[PDB]
Amino acid sequence: SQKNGIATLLQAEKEAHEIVSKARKYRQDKLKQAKTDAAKEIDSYKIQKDKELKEF
């Protein structure tokens, strides 16, 4: 099982690489996300300011 076992170990290394690579794609996206939900955060704060203005 020595010459079955390496072949399995090579596969594990390739796998360790793909799981870490999904996270790094995730991270970039996570950064993009932060700008989108902040784009939405301004125009919801904008309608909040018109709220206490129209109240005035």
Partner 1 sequence: LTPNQVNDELNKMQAFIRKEAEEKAKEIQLKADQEYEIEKTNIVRNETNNID
Partner 2 sequence: DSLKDYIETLGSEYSTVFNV
Q: Which residues bind partner 2 (CB under 8 A)?
A: 2, 5-6, 9-10, 12-13
How far, in Å, are 15, 28, 35, 37 from residue 31 at the CA level? Answer: 25, 5, 7, 10
Structure tokens at 13: 């290394």
CA angle 46, 36, 28 (to 5 degrees): 155
Decide: is 53 part of the binding site for partner 1 (CB under 8 A). no
Site string for partner 1, 15-34 (x = CB under 8 A): xxx-xx-xxx-xx--xx-xx
Binding site for partner 1 (CB under 8 A): 1-2, 5, 8-9, 12-13, 15-17, 19-20, 22-24, 26-27, 30-31, 33-35, 37-38, 41-42, 45-46, 49
